[PDB]
């Protein structure tokens with residue numbers, strides 16, 4: 001019979017033994033296990049998406065992207081375990097390097113030195129440069145999706161919400177539904193954007209930088225609507241130039257209806273922060289997405305001078321160019337290489 005963990009089947013075959021329940025992830029149960037071929041403990045996450053088209057989409061995205069990408073700052077897939085036939089395929093197990101912790105857990109309890117903040121931010125952006133060079137948007141960057149090992153090597157994970165960039169089709173109406181994590185949501189998402197441009201990710205990285213500086217999320221919106229409140233509460237009212245860039249009347253007039261708010265200076269919010277870090281923060285957390293700094297510019301910012309080296313910041317060789325039953329088949333096919 002298959003191995004059991006906390007009631008349910010965690011059937012990872014003979015190669016992976018000594019299972020330990022690590023916790024719950026976005027996809028379900030996650031366990032550590034000893035890899036008998038490589039003699040290391042690994043992370044294994046159990047995925048059960050086949051009953052629902054939406055779950056299948058996210059699982060396929062996660063798998064297809066992570067299998068294509070190969071980068072020091074992006075979590076790899078080492079192995080995928082599943083049944084030999086589609087009919088028997090019940091669950092999929094994704095095997096990854098075991099990572100001590102993640103930035104969410106770390107920030108709950110640990111103060112980061114400026115050196116750590118700098119190093120973490122460099123790695124995030126180095127990983128993001130690769131992702132963006134593949135014409136892909138991560139779209140759910142947040143501390144819990146940044147894994148760390150015992151020597152603080154950082155790896156971006158969870159590409160379930162990722163999309164191919166589509167800037168020509170980015171415009172939408174005001175207060176249009178969105179799925180990515182609220183606190184890390186760029187202001188344009190609530191105004192006139194579907195989140196199909198690279199600038200969406202940079203905003204999230206800015207929030208992450210802010211959160212590393214203080215151990216508190218900078219824009220902790222209590223609900224969808226509240227999020228924009230928090231952002232404007234710190235950036236202050238948008239300029240006329242920036243309003244003029246928003247053609248949609250509902251969005252623009254909403255902003256015009258608000259009482260004036262002044263910018264809160266970054267150095268008053270973060271009195272202990274490196275001034276160069278605050279300069280970079282300001283550029284990532286720019287209201288107008290067209291004026292927001294891009295990943296390659298961020299890497300070249302003086303804050304990151306100790307690490308910046310474009311020849312050692314690789315890009316993707318092959319960028320991405322663009323029902324559940326077919327999705328299960330696609331997932332089955334995408335995972336075939338591990339049989």
Ligand SMILES: Nc1nc(N)n(-c2ccccc2)n1
Nearest residue numbers: 024025030043096097098099
């Ligand atoms: N690669 C890896 N390593 C761990 N611990 N991971 C994990 C992922 C989700 C929840 C708990 C742990 N993932």
